[PDB]
Design a protein around this nucleic acid. Structure first.
Ligand SMILES: [Mg+2]
Ligand SMILES: [Mg+2]
Ligand SMILES: [Mg+2]
Ligand SMILES: [Mg+2]
Ligand SMILES: [Mg+2]
Ligand SMILES: [Mg+2]
Ligand SMILES: [Mg+2]
Ligand SMILES: [Mg+2]
Ligand SMILES: [Mg+2]
Ligand SMILES: [Mg+2]
Ligand SMILES: [Mg+2]
Ligand SMILES: [Mg+2]
Ligand SMILES: [Mg+2]
Ligand SMILES: [Mg+2]
Ligand SMILES: [Mg+2]
Ligand SMILES: [Mg+2]
Ligand SMILES: [Mg+2]
Ligand SMILES: [Mg+2]
Ligand SMILES: [Mg+2]
Ligand SMILES: [Mg+2]
Ligand SMILES: [Mg+2]
Ligand SMILES: [Mg+2]
Ligand SMILES: [Mg+2]
Ligand SMILES: [Mg+2]
Ligand SMILES: [Mg+2]
Ligand SMILES: [Mg+2]
Ligand SMILES: [Mg+2]
Ligand SMILES: [Mg+2]
Ligand SMILES: [Mg+2]
Ligand SMILES: [Mg+2]
Ligand SMILES: [Mg+2]
Ligand SMILES: [Mg+2]
Ligand SMILES: [Mg+2]
Ligand SMILES: [Mg+2]
Ligand SMILES: [Mg+2]
Ligand SMILES: [Mg+2]
Ligand SMILES: [Mg+2]
Ligand SMILES: [Mg+2]
Ligand SMILES: [Mg+2]
Ligand SMILES: [Mg+2]
Ligand SMILES: [Mg+2]
Ligand SMILES: [Mg+2]
Ligand SMILES: [Mg+2]
Ligand SMILES: [Mg+2]
Ligand SMILES: [Mg+2]
Ligand SMILES: [Mg+2]
Ligand SMILES: [Mg+2]
Ligand SMILES: [Mg+2]
Ligand SMILES: [Mg+2]
Ligand SMILES: [Mg+2]
Ligand SMILES: [Mg+2]
Ligand SMILES: [Mg+2]
Ligand SMILES: [Mg+2]
Ligand SMILES: [Mg+2]
Ligand SMILES: [Mg+2]
Ligand SMILES: [Mg+2]
Ligand SMILES: [Mg+2]
Ligand SMILES: [Mg+2]
Ligand SMILES: [Mg+2]
Ligand SMILES: [Mg+2]
Ligand SMILES: [Mg+2]
Ligand SMILES: [Mg+2]
Ligand SMILES: [Mg+2]
Ligand SMILES: [Mg+2]
Ligand SMILES: [Mg+2]
Ligand SMILES: [Mg+2]
Ligand SMILES: [Mg+2]
Ligand SMILES: [Mg+2]
Ligand SMILES: [Mg+2]
Ligand SMILES: [Mg+2]
Ligand SMILES: [Mg+2]
Ligand SMILES: [Mg+2]
Ligand SMILES: [Mg+2]
Ligand SMILES: [Mg+2]
Ligand SMILES: [Mg+2]
Ligand SMILES: [Mg+2]
Ligand SMILES: [Mg+2]
Ligand SMILES: [Mg+2]
Ligand SMILES: [Mg+2]
Ligand SMILES: [Mg+2]
Ligand SMILES: [Mg+2]
Ligand SMILES: [Mg+2]
Ligand SMILES: [Mg+2]
Ligand SMILES: [Mg+2]
Ligand SMILES: [Mg+2]
Ligand SMILES: [Mg+2]
Ligand SMILES: [Mg+2]
Ligand SMILES: [Mg+2]
Ligand SMILES: [Mg+2]
Ligand SMILES: [Mg+2]
Ligand SMILES: [Mg+2]
Ligand SMILES: [Mg+2]
Ligand SMILES: [Mg+2]
Ligand SMILES: [Mg+2]
Ligand SMILES: [Mg+2]
Ligand SMILES: [Mg+2]
Ligand SMILES: [Mg+2]
Lengths: 141, 38, 208, 174
RNA sequence: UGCUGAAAGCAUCUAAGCACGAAACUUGCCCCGAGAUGAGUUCUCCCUGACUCCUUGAGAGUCCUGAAGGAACGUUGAAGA
RNA sequence: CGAUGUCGGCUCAUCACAUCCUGGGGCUGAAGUAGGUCCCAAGGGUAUGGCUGUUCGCCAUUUAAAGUGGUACGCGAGCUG
RNA sequence: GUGAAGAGGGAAACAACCCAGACCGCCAGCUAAGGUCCCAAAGUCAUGGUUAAGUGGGAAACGAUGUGGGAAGGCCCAGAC
């Protein structure tokens, strides 16, 4: 008796909303990744994208503990001769507050085609309005 | 000021203060006795 | 804002003080506003102009339609400018060269003259190696292009041979000399990009 | 702890309001607002003000004695109104006031037009002396430091802008 | 460098708070840049036909139409191997 | 060791900062000028000759300065020898 | 003792370290060393503390009213700092 595997065509996809206002970055990101991967579902299959669509609204208001508002740095190389560009957690939210959640989730997802496929599910937002009212995305906490 | 790794109270008016993580020794009489670090 | 203008060679203006100032003659035809982009529709306030003329067959129907919505004649090309808050323009308005009458300095932009494929000497001012003293097949070559095992690679943006010119370049803050409205000209002090008959974009200096 | 264990007296005609932690003290000289720290807890008990710590928070007594002394200053400010006496020492150096903008001539090639933020009433009894008054110790203390920052005391002749109470250390030429 | 200021009846630039402060940092200047697969906006333009077959498929087809536009070709260029 | 061409020059560089100049600062045995030292700072800049294979070095004359190091003592399928 | 001549699990990757010695098959269960928020199987377990340094997650002599937990001493309402 061969065990069950979730077949993409039959996979049920749910929509969710998460208000990140005051929530802790890592603890939010984790619970997001868990869902985006589809670990909460009893039909979990590692080679299929069983997870749900999530809208994270109010990204900029996400909270961080200790001195990480100033001290937590986000490095990245430009792929150039000596181009190493850094940016603190403040500076990151000043310019691109969507990136903060994005980067924190992307690191916690698996690396590869399915990992990138399950990131696409995530929909981060700086403000509180979201234009996915069509899908009736229910509230998640 | 001095940035020596063993700051200490040199005269009587010298006073030890921890500003922004760093231990300093601010003084009233001689501005020389002003010294940071350690 | 800015105006589109054909480059028409160079001359010099002799002043009676005893100075010849070398001027580029930019002929600026009536720059007619074909479309006005705003924050409601587009997300930025701007105007799209045209200039010159085109042939009835050589213009396509997509352009001919676009031009028919404004009511203007089809100009040879389309350029766009941003608006500086206070100023606001209407469709089918012909902007003349009198806009640069009150100003003093302008940033002329243009596509530079195509030098083709260029060697490192011409392109990057690399120094020619010894013309003799034993040199074998390597007078104008680049020499080394990297270190050894540590990178084990040429770094990016390494100055090499390749395409020189035919690229957009901006000469900044050239002094305006004469602004003839009758003949539709704009005389600026010094040399500006492209060749005689090339399209320039003249616009007020940004470093006032 | 012990500064905190010493109630602040509130004279008559001094209307106080505690909007949760946001305190507002109104008076004759000026209306002042202070968004106080969350760890501190404040109440009205009889005529005077009470100041104490919150149970659960680590540093209560440090935070409590701040609020006490802040509002002690704040009440004295709205009642009396603080003053600072700055003096300009050295020839050529002189002060002047036109409206709310202190005009100085502190030996520089350009006029040093200092602006006055908030309700700060500045004056000049003599040409080489600035006396300035107001409600806050903060804004007065800061402005006074900004006037002094333009030309600090040269420790040789004592030239520059000085506080009246301040002693300056001189030294000889070698 | 300071201001106000508890712990520590004082002092104290710091623990709450409030300011200054460099050719470094992010911008401002210039260039590229939507393959930014997260492939984004506008503006315009064009095509408004009959019928068969099947596993009733985002389907294999038949006649009939061929637009906007493009490519080719030519004459070529201060564009170019 | 069934081969990893090894000094110096030329060409082209790139990073570190333990900064030579430029910029910001504290103390002085800092009057000013000109310094001494230490702190921050790597954005940009940082000689040409004489002698010698020389790297260095010593000279000559400059320069705001004429930095110290890493990069197979960077760089011979790039040159020289 | 191990490797050599030993696979497997842990130590990110790691002959020689820790766990443990592969006769073959099985889409069964119990464990070891390691672990149990996500990458990644399992505690966002419970309880009582300690750290504010991103310590944990490189380093010494020395330097500090950082901050817990004790055990003694001072010496005072005739109010000691
Ligand atoms: Mg500071
Ligand atoms: Mg629309
Ligand atoms: Mg044409
Ligand atoms: Mg050409
Ligand atoms: Mg050439
Ligand atoms: Mg060169
Ligand atoms: Mg040469
Ligand atoms: Mg030869
Ligand atoms: Mg050869
Ligand atoms: Mg040969
Ligand atoms: Mg040749
Ligand atoms: Mg590599
Ligand atoms: Mg406790
Ligand atoms: Mg004071
Ligand atoms: Mg005080
Ligand atoms: Mg004491
Ligand atoms: Mg004490
Ligand atoms: Mg004080
Ligand atoms: Mg002070
Ligand atoms: Mg400069
Ligand atoms: Mg483009
Ligand atoms: Mg895609
Ligand atoms: Mg599109
Ligand atoms: Mg659309
Ligand atoms: Mg549309
Ligand atoms: Mg079939
Ligand atoms: Mg046809
Ligand atoms: Mg045909
Ligand atoms: Mg037709
Ligand atoms: Mg051709
Ligand atoms: Mg040709
Ligand atoms: Mg061999
Ligand atoms: Mg071999
Ligand atoms: Mg070789
Ligand atoms: Mg060599
Ligand atoms: Mg030579
Ligand atoms: Mg050389
Ligand atoms: Mg460079
Ligand atoms: Mg460097
Ligand atoms: Mg040194
Ligand atoms: Mg130096
Ligand atoms: Mg110097
Ligand atoms: Mg200078
Ligand atoms: Mg300087
Ligand atoms: Mg300066
Ligand atoms: Mg200096
Ligand atoms: Mg001095
Ligand atoms: Mg210092
Ligand atoms: Mg340094
Ligand atoms: Mg650099
Ligand atoms: Mg840098
Ligand atoms: Mg910069
Ligand atoms: Mg450079
Ligand atoms: Mg040099
Ligand atoms: Mg030299
Ligand atoms: Mg010499
Ligand atoms: Mg060196
Ligand atoms: Mg070698
Ligand atoms: Mg070496
Ligand atoms: Mg070598
Ligand atoms: Mg060396
Ligand atoms: Mg050769
Ligand atoms: Mg070599
Ligand atoms: Mg080589
Ligand atoms: Mg060769
Ligand atoms: Mg030979
Ligand atoms: Mg020979
Ligand atoms: Mg073993
Ligand atoms: Mg053997
Ligand atoms: Mg083994
Ligand atoms: Mg193993
Ligand atoms: Mg290891
Ligand atoms: Mg692992
Ligand atoms: Mg492993
Ligand atoms: Mg082994
Ligand atoms: Mg053991
Ligand atoms: Mg066995
Ligand atoms: Mg066995
Ligand atoms: Mg078990
Ligand atoms: Mg057991
Ligand atoms: Mg164990
Ligand atoms: Mg265990
Ligand atoms: Mg993996
Ligand atoms: Mg798990
Ligand atoms: Mg789990
Ligand atoms: Mg849970
Ligand atoms: Mg919990
Ligand atoms: Mg727990
Ligand atoms: Mg617990
Ligand atoms: Mg505790
Ligand atoms: Mg704690
Ligand atoms: Mg560490
Ligand atoms: Mg360390
Ligand atoms: Mg001690
Ligand atoms: Mg204490
Ligand atoms: Mg603690
Ligand atoms: Mg004990």
């Amino acid at each position: 008796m061969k065990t069950f595997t979730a077949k993409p065509e039959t996979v049920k996809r749910d929509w969710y909303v998460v208000d990140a206002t005051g929530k802790t970055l890592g603890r939010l990101a984790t619970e997001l990744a868990r869902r985006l991967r589809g670990k909460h579902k009893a039909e979990y299959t590692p080679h299929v994208d069983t997870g749900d669509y999530i809208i994270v609204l109010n990204a900029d208001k996400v909270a961080v503990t200790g001195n990480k508002r100033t001290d937590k740095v986000y490095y990245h190389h430009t792929g150039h001769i000596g181009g190493i560009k850094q940016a603190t957690f403040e500076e990151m939210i000043a310019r691109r507050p969507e990136r903060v959640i994005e980067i924190a989730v992307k690191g916690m997802l698996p690396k590869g085609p399915l990992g990138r496929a399950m990131f696409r599910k995530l929909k981060v937002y700086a403000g509180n309005e979201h234009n996915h009212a069509a899908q009736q995305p229910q509230v998640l906490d | 000021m001095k940035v020596r790794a063993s700051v200490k109270k040199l005269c009587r008016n010298c006073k030890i203060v921890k500003r922004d993580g760093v231990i300093r020794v601010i003084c009233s009489a001689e501005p020389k006795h002003k010294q940071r670090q350690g | 804002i800015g105006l589109v203008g054909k480059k028409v060679g160079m001359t010099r203006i002799f002043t009676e003080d005893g100075v010849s100032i070398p001027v580029t003659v930019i002929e600026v035809e009536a720059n007619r506003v074909t479309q006005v982009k705003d924050l409601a529709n587009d997300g930025y306030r701007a105007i799209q102009v045209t200039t010159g003329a085109k042939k009835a067959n050589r213009v396509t129907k997509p352009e001919a339609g676009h031009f028919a919505k404004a009511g203007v004649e089809a100009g040879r090309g389309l350029w766009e400018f941003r608006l500086a808050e206070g100023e606001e323009f209407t469709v089918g308005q012909s902007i003349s060269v009198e806009l640069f009458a009150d100003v003093k300095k302008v940033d002329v932009t243009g596509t530079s003259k195509g030098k083709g494929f260029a060697g490192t000497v011409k392109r990057w001012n690399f120094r020619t190696q010894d013309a003799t003293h034993g040199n074998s097949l390597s007078h104008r070559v680049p020499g080394s292009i990297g270190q050894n095992q540590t990178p084990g690679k040429v770094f990016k943006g390494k100055k090499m041979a390749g395409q020189m010119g035919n690229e957009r370049v901006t000469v900044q803050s050239l002094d305006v000399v004469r602004v003839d409205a009758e003949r539709n000209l704009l005389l600026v002090k010094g040399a500006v990009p492209g060749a005689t008959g090339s399209d320039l974009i003249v616009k007020p200096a940004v470093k006032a | 702890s012990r500064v905190a264990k010493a109630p602040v007296v509130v004279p008559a005609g001094v209307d106080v309001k505690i909007n949760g932690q946001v305190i507002t003290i109104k008076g004759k000289n000026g209306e002042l607002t202070r968004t106080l720290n969350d760890a501190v807890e404040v109440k009205h008990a009889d005529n005077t003000l009470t100041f104490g710590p919150r149970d659960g928070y680590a540093d209560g007594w440090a935070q409590a004695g701040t609020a006490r002394a802040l509002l002690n200053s704040m009440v004295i400010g709205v009642t009396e109104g603080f003053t600072k006496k700055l003096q300009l020492v050295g020839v050529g150096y002189r002060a002047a006031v036109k409206g709310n903008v202190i005009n100085l001539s502190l030996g520089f090639s350009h006029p040093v037009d200092h602006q006055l933020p908030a309700g700060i009433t500045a004056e000049c009894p003599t040409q080489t002396e600035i006396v300035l008054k107001g409600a806050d110790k903060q804004v007065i203390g800061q402005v006074a430091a900004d006037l002094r920052a333009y030309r600090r005391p040269e420790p040789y002749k004592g030239k520059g802008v000085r506080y009246a109470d301040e002693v300056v250390r001189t030294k000889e030429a070698k």
